[PDB]
Amino acid sequence: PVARSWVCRKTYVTPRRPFEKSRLDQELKLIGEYGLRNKREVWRVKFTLAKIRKAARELLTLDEKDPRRLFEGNALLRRLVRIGVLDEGKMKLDYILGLKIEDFLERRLQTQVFKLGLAKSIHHARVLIRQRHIRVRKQVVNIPSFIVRLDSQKHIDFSLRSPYGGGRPGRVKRKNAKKG
Template identity: 40%
Template sequence: MGDPKRQRKRYETPSHPWIKERLDRERVLMKKYALKNKKELWRHETQLKEFRRRARRLLAARGRQAEVERAQLLQRLNRLGLLPADAALDDVLSLTVEDVLDRRLQTLVYKKGLARTIGQARQLIVHGHIEINGQIIRSPGYLVLREEEDTITYSKTSPFAKESHPERMVIEQAKQGEAS
């Protein structure tokens, strides 16, 4: 049967725990994106650091393998919706953690108007009311691919799928109120 794969931390904690500027910045992001805890924020910051580290290494590298890796990195970031198709490697260095947080399923559900608040978007996802390509996703931190973005809907088995659901009516009225 073999040994199970070792679970590793997917985030790096800050080097110093009490830097006021960082704490203030994190507090604003936690509230804006309705994150459960700092670990979620640190995970996306670490992901961004890894993209930027690879880009810096590839900017300095020469050769055919470096070209292949450059194309793969840019293609990956394009698929995630973080960069446009015609982006250069320098554009990777200008990405911010907010760019990554904007690609979370939780944020996109809110921006598409499927939820009144970003907190409600998180609840709908965790409770299994949201699907992508017919597949229920229960992770609010799921990074949505560019081609999946248009397929975010209410789950077919969810009560929210009915147009007559009371909460759907409230959400629709809120949308119309914002439009006028």
């Protein structure tokens, strides 16, 4: 007996057929578009989408006024809207079955740092977050895959402690400036 929990989950699925050209090319498309480190981030987002689709299908097998359908559909729709993947005017479960991996890829912190003009590229965005220059609200966030909510979209900025931000010069610049 120990005061430990052993509850833990794999968060991705390896595909059944390893070598098919269309899936490889589409994965490479997404990796290049979004600056992902490897195929496993594609598999991770694909997994969360598959989970959400299974939940929506099992809710849709229920009859229309079933209270579990109303409660759990409202919760699922509210969460998908809250991370900005579904529009607010599309609170219908069937629209969940229309989504794509690219939406949850657009809601990453890497992509939102790229689209807000703090970075010159998507790879510059991953590097910018990973090196403690990006802060959401007033919290330094180091994780590229941090999914940004709609109330947190207008609050992504530069760390008040970063050289590009508040302004203490970095290690290289302070080394070079003291040579002369």
